[PDB]
Every structure is written in C-alpha cells, then in structure tokens.
Design a protein around this ligand. Structure first.
Ligand SMILES: [Mg+2]
Ligand SMILES: [Mg+2]
Ligand SMILES: [Mg+2]
Ligand SMILES: [Mg+2]
Lengths: 292, 279, 276, 293
C-alpha cells in the first residue's frame, strides 16, 4: 500500500534561509524511509523547477517541492499546462507559503515532510488568466519600497503580505475604473483594489476575501470601491473576514481604462484586460486532513 | 553536420487514408537511413500525440508528425506551452494539411520524408489566444461530410456562396463594428489553398487581423470567387477581441476557446523543417 | 502482443551495405506491427553489446540486423545480465548460423515478417570460462574466409588440408590424440546443418565431438557426404585440457584459450523462431 | 567542480542492523547536500542491487551502495560484466565490510557518506574466476550450535572460518593442481586461496602483502602437513611471509582438484572447481580514503 511508486523531490537550495545540509537532515530522511524510489534534484536557476516538472511529469507519481511561493508557482506553471499531472506536495521553504497553509501543511519542515508520508490527497482547483495559471490570487492595485529594510520585509512577507502590513497607513491610494463581467452579469465602478482569489490564505494569514475554498469549483471576486478605502483599512485591522463588492463566479473578464500590470502567485508578465477561468480539480495535492 | 542526434516519429495510423503498411514503406526507410537514432510511436486515441510530445520534448531533438491538421494541432498544443521545444516537422497525412503547405512541404508523403533528411530549419511564430496556441488561424463567424475531408475553414470556403454580430478589437488602437467574419491569421495557407487573408507570413513577427463587415458580404463572396488575394485588414502583435455575447471560436483543430480573447504572438517559438525551394 | 516495446539494432554494413534498400525491406513490417519501435544503428565494434546492455531493462524485444559477429555482440551483451528480453535475428551476414537454427528465412523481408508472428521459444546459452556462446566452441579449426566465417571456411577446405586432449564430462573422462575438438550448441554450423549429429539448442545438454588423430580420412569423407548421423557424447558440465595452451574459436572475436570449463545455461534466452 | 553529475544510492533497508530511518538520517543528508542529482533506491529482494546496477550503469556517474559484503558483491556482479561501469562507493552496512576496509572507508556510516563527498577515486583490480567476478577472495577448504550460527552470520564465511580454525580437529585434505603463469604447484592441501582484498574477515589479510591494485593476484596454499603451523600463524596475527605454506603472486591461474569442490567467494555463488582465474586490471574506479590509503 502506497499511491506513489516513484517520487521526485525538487529542492531549492536557497529555501529555509539557505542552511542546506540542516534543511536536508529535516526533510529527506522521512521521505527516503517511506518512499523506496526517490529522486532528489536541486534547482540552480530561475525556471529550473518548471523544467524539472515538465521533464518528470510523465515519469513519477509524486512531485514534492521544497521552496517558497515562487518555487511553488514555478511548479504550478510547469504542471498545469500538461496532459499528465502527478500529485504535488509542498514543503514550505519561504516565509509566506500561502498554498501550503491552504493545504493545512505544518510550517515546520520536518513535520511537512512526515505529512507527505501519510499520502492524504485531495483535488485542487487551478485558475487560469489569459493562459497564465495560478493557485492563490490574481490582483490589481497591490503595487513602493524605500530601502533595504522595507525591501527585506517585502521579500520576507511577499507582495500581498507586504500590502496588508502597510494598507492601514497608505495615504491617498490610486483609484481606477474597472469593468468586470462574471457569468453573464456586470460590475462597473471606480476601484482601489480588484482581486480574484483561489487560495484560502493570502499573505500568510487566512484570506481577507471571505469564505474562499480552493476546491469548490468557483472563484471569488473581491473589489474595494474608491469610496471604501477607510472601511477596508478597518476591515483588515479587525481580521474578521466575513461578507466592498464580493461575489463567486466561474468565468470572469476584467477590463480597465489603460493596460494595468497584474500581480499573482509569483513573477509574471500578465496585464489587463484578462479573461479568467477555473480548472476544477486540475491538481491533486498532498494535504493535512486533520487541519484543513 | 546533423542537427538532430535523436528523432521521434509520431504516426497516426489512420492518416494517409489508413493504408498503414504502405504509408510506412514510403516514410520510414528514408528517415531510418538518415537518422541513426529513430523512435517510432503510433497514436491510439485522441490526445496521444500531445502526450508523446510532452514526454519526449526533453529527450529528442526532432519530432516528426505523420497526420492531418488535427494531429499537427495536438503537437502544437503539446509543445507550445513547454520551456524546451525541439524542432518539429510534418509529413502530411490528412486532406488539408495547411501548415505543411506553409512550410513548402510536398504533399507526396515519401517526398515529405526525404525533405526532412535535408534538415532545412526555420523559426516559426506561434500564436496564443487566452492560453490556447495556434499555427494557422483563429476565427469567429465560420458557421455534407465533405466538411471532415476539407476541414472547418476549407468547408466554409467551399460553401460561402447571413448572421451579423458586434465586435470590438483592440490592437497595439481600436476597431468597432458589425461583422460577419473575424479572423486572425498566422498560416500562409487556409483551407488547403493560399490564405485569403493577404500577405500573411508565419515568421514576420506580427499577426494579421481580417474582418468582413456586415455591409461587405457580397464583396467577400466575389473576392473568394476570384482567388486574387491582395474589408478591414491590419497587422498587429497584441490583440483583444470582444463580442456582445460569448461566441465560440474556431481554430486549427478541436478546442473549447470562446470570446472574449487576448491574442499574443510568440515570435520564433517553434523551429520547423521546411522546403527552401518553395519561394 | 507479447512485446510492448521493441528495439531494432541495425548494423549499417549488413546485407552488403545497401542501407536504404535493406531498411525498405525490414523496417515497414516491424513498424506496422509494433507501435513502439526504436531503431539504433551501430557505428563501432562493441555498439551492439552496449545497446543490449543499456536497453535490456527497457524493452521487451531486441531485434538484431547483422551477421554472426553482430549476433555474438548481442549474445555477449545480454547473456551476463539478470534481465534478458527476447531476442530475434534478421540475417545480415553470409553465414547467419543461429538464425538458421531458429528456422529464420534468409530473405530479410521474410525474416522481418516472421518476427511479427511472435513465435518464441527458450534457447540454451553455453558458457566457457565466463565467455558465452550460441553456436560452438572448438579447437583445431581471405575473401572466402571472411564470407564463409571461420567454421564455414574450415569445412570448405578440410577435404584438402594433432594434439593431446583430456575431457572430463559429468564425472567421466576421455583422453586421446585429437585433430578437432568441438562443443556444439547450434543446429547449424558454417551455414549448413551441424556436422555434429542431433544437436538441439534447447535440450539442456551440450554435444562434445572429437575427431581422433587416426580418424582424419574418415572425417573428410563424413564431411563430403553431408549425412550427419570417433567420439560424440552429450554432457552438461565439461572441462577440456590440452598439453599446452591452445587458442579457441567460437561464434565471433574472442580471447579464449584452454584450459576451459564449459557450462550450459538452460533456457537462458527466449528467441523468435519459425515453427514451420 | 564535481566528477559526478548524477548519483545513485542503493539502500539495503536491512543493513546497519535495520534501523532504517536512523541510518538514512546519517547517510542521506551529506550526499544530498553535495550531489544536486541524487536517486535513492531501496532493494526489496536478493538480486535487486545487481539489477539496479545493470539498469543504471549507463545512466549515472556514481553508484553508492549501503550494505554489507553481500550487497557489495551484488554490485560487483552487476557492474563487472558491463562495457560501461561508473565509479562505485561503499557505505559499510554489514558487520564485516571487507572491501570498504580495503578502501580505507571509515566504519562509521555518517563518516563513510561524508568521505564520498570528497570524491577521491582510484582504480581497483577485479578478479574473474570462470566468469564469476570477485573483489576480496576465492577459496576452497573454508556451525556446531546456535551460537556458531549467529556468529557465522555476523562475521561472514571467511570471518567465521578464522574465528574457529584454531579448533578444527581433523580437517579434510585434498589434492590440488595449480598452474600459474606457466609454472605448476601440485600437492595435498587443506586450504587454497586466491586473494585480491587487503582485508579478509574484518581484519588485515592473512595472505601477506595483498594489494587490490598491483595488477597481480596472490595464491596462498596451506599444505596438509601445515595445519598446526597455520593455526599458530592465525593466532599470532603477524601476516608476513616465513614454511609448509605456499604463497606466490600471479596473473593467470588455473586450479584443479580430484573431484569438483565447492568454492567460497565474496558472497553467495555456485562456483566450483575446476577454475580459470584472471585479473582485470583497473576494472573498477572506486571512492577511497587517501588519508588512510
Ligand atoms: Mg474557489
Ligand atoms: Mg505573421
Ligand atoms: Mg543441446
Ligand atoms: Mg593484487
């Protein structure tokens, strides 16, 4: 009894603060004891994880990634476009690790590795925006680092985490027109933030978009109107994330007046306009049934 | 001197009218003689060619496909999303074989196979519409079994002798009108004959937008009749197309794309075997 | 089908070196029948051995297009391994002894077709001091020599052409002056049915055949007559000693010499054959 | 700046007394930190290590085996007959681990793993007897109670023989003929060995001055008249030449007995006499400890 005859572990050697030998002591032995056919590849350059996923997708039954949101995103882009997509698992090696939290994965990396040996798997929806896949979110209006301190915190927290840490003090925020068509309906207004969420955690903490699930077959649209800046600041302060326009939809189109740059799970070249679709149960992933 | 240390040949056994042994007699010996490491896989089901491309892309230097537009499209979708994409070649095994004609590939399959042994390669642009790739075309307004023989676009051309719709197109500017046909072309041949969209090249780094206005139905019918291919038509790299309702889109083969669409061009995305004598 | 994946090893010099024409004859029947077929050409001596060793765990059938020497490279490639896929021969030399043992037609298009019928049988492989063989082991054996092979050449000239030997075989002993000592596994030697009578490549024993020093003239006549029915016995475990080291001839190029311990590996290969 | 782009680690999960997780904690992290392409396969049955070697020999640049003399022998038989033979390394996971000691590999398994990361390699001769390869020895003339049987498994065949030879009462004598590089030895013997390893039975070779890379093999024969002197020789552990004990170096060897006698070697096998024995000079490249040599 195993679901996974062959396993690949992709290691970003800079993950877990870059203490490589110590990180491998924590994660490899549980996996090597449990999985009698285990291949371990370190990345060297940006894109390597994507390439490994595309090369090994037809060869292994499980791909485990040790890395932060960026490494996980490389795997998302590697596997999502393929016909054959093995189960994916995350050992959280950044500071944010949003999707791992969505899957209930303990942030202790030794514990994350042990969890994978339990082999609990569930289907997970993958979103697609103009042919660009994501697991956590799509957003405009999340855009300001003055210095290394700020830049180190921004890198540590992630784009969304950083935005949340500073939104309560962001004086005079940029407003913009937006048109959103969703399952035959329309929303048009002046906005300060537009999000489409798939992850149950954003910025390291439960999604500020209420009641997001990564496997319910719909996406969540969340818009902060130009008149709602203070109410959103207060809402973020209180951390009570119950239902500013917010609706669930499967097929979404978002237009702005000018082409605006889009933020998503990691580095990308998306901009508006965007057509956004959902691929239901597209990935199977290791998760923690006790917590999630 | 060889550019291709390892070669994969994907065979759709139903191609070339399905006379499998005879077709293999024509195509395999020239390839096996020229390429000392040659792997031959037959497809069995829809999607197999896509799977083979994705499994072998990191393993071989050349993938040859023996099949019609649909098999070629499966290879286009297999390879286009990947980081590593080996050279692709086509042995035309359907009735239309548009992109093979774009590459100057002789429709004689033995000759197409020999051509590959010459190893003439050129970059080819690949288009992408909302994450769906194509080599020949994207279109809306393209609407008896001769339909299967000719292909969607070939069939449309055979019968063009009424439905209008609103369309908005943003390109690099804006075009807004009532239309009967909207095309974005990348292939030099459509429906088995030279593109009715004038002066299309698959490697010039831009796409061609071609719109038949609601007032232009008769002029387009006459234009198609005359076969002088020289109505709004413009070249652009980044394109967005909106309709009033979600309209189904036709492309190189079977697909689920619909409007609205963002269309991009990936310059030189593929390298492909071609015939430099056809000029 | 018994063969999900197939490898075809091509020696491009086989079949007189008319490569394209030879591929027209052999590849289409195989490619039509086997939907996963990988074709590799050899370039240097030893390539066929390497290919067999690399692909033995990956494919279910290995077909070799080549003469006795190419077949011997495959024999040496596969025989020492734990996992040995079925082997088939398309005869691309002049002699092709083991192909004849298997009833393979010498017409290469017809040999290729036969493979598509997938008739398979176990075949014994012999081993002498760690050197494997399919046809023969022997002591006492230029354009014509290369065409016919060592054993074929010997037979073509024996009618116009001595040493001490001790042979222990399954606990018994033979000791005499000899002119030829053979151990046969193949049913054909030198392109014609084995001059060692009633050899079978799959009966679980080897055949020892010794021409005594006094038997030269009788052996010449025996070869002339080609009725193949001096010492001949069947045995499984064999040791052969001479007074000095003598060089040994076998299926192809090798560095064997006496003394030799010879063993039989029963059913060691499975091979494509012609049941008709 | 590495010699090994791809590495395979073969794990016998019963090695190191079978504490699998703890053993992997000791050996895998150093290797995984040093080798950015590392494939780890566990054996399940006898023969698996042989099969893994034969499958991966053309695919990887280094094969590391974690296991005892038997697992190492499976690798020896896997790789030795092949045309392409990657470098081999041993992490000692049995009790004896003779060849690892020949290579100066520390018996501490975490230290053995670290050593591999240093990438020190040397050529090693591999012997071949009637097509059966070996690294340590070939021998003829080599369990009273549960104690004996337990100690036999712990020590290995040659280690066990050495632990009990001082007790053996009326040992079987047998006739033997040995031809070696054109010369001959014929006598009644109680033990005949051909040695290639520098350690036998867990301690330095009782055959004097054996080297695994000097291009010759060592023949060592205890005559029927020399039983007592050999017992005393083993007792004293001074393994230098001195006289009813025949010892010579040779490259091409043939050994004949009156009847077919069963042969013992590095691990389980079906060899018997008569035997032709050859040496394949530099046949393997192997990881070693140049500090201990
Ligand atoms: Mg959802
Ligand atoms: Mg163009
Ligand atoms: Mg027989
Ligand atoms: Mg030595």
């Amino acid at each position: 009894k195993t679901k996974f005859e062959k396993v690949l572990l992709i290691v970003n050697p800079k993950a877990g603060q870059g203490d490589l030998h110590t990180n491998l002591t924590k994660i490899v032995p549980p996996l090597a004891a449990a999985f009698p056919d285990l291949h371990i590849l370190h990345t060297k350059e940006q894109g390597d994880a994507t390439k490994y996923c595309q090369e090994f997708a037809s060869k292994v039954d499980l791909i485990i990634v040790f890395g932060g949101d960026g490494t996980v995103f490389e795997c998302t882009n590697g596997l999502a476009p393929l016909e054959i997509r093995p189960t994916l698992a995350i050992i959280p090696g950044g500071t944010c690790n949003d999707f791992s939290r969505t899957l209930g994965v303990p942030q202790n990396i030794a514990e994350a590795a042990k969890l994978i040996t339990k082999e609990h798997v569930k289907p997970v929806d993958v979103a697609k925006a103009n042919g660009q896949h994501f697991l956590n979110f799509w957003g405009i209006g999340l855009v300001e680092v003055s210095n290394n301190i700020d830049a180190e915190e921004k890198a540590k927290l992630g784009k969304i985490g950083y935005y949340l840490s500073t939104i309560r003090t962001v004086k005079n925020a940029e407003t913009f027109p937006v048109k959103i068509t969703y399952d035959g309906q329309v929303y048009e207004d002046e906005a300060v933030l537009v999000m489409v969420g798939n992850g149950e955690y954003l910025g390291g903490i439960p999604s500020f978009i209420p009641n997001v699930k990564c496997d319910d077959g719909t996406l969540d649209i969340f818009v902060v109107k130009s008149t709602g800046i203070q109410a959103f600041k207060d809402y973020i302060g209180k951390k009570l994330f119950e239902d500013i326009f917010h609706v669930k939809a499967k097929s979404i189109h978002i237009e702005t007046e000018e082409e605006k740059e889009v933020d998503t799970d990691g580095e990308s070249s998306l901009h508006t306009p965007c057509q956004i679709e959902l691929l239901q149960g597209h990935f199977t992933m290791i998760y923690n049934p006790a917590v999630v």
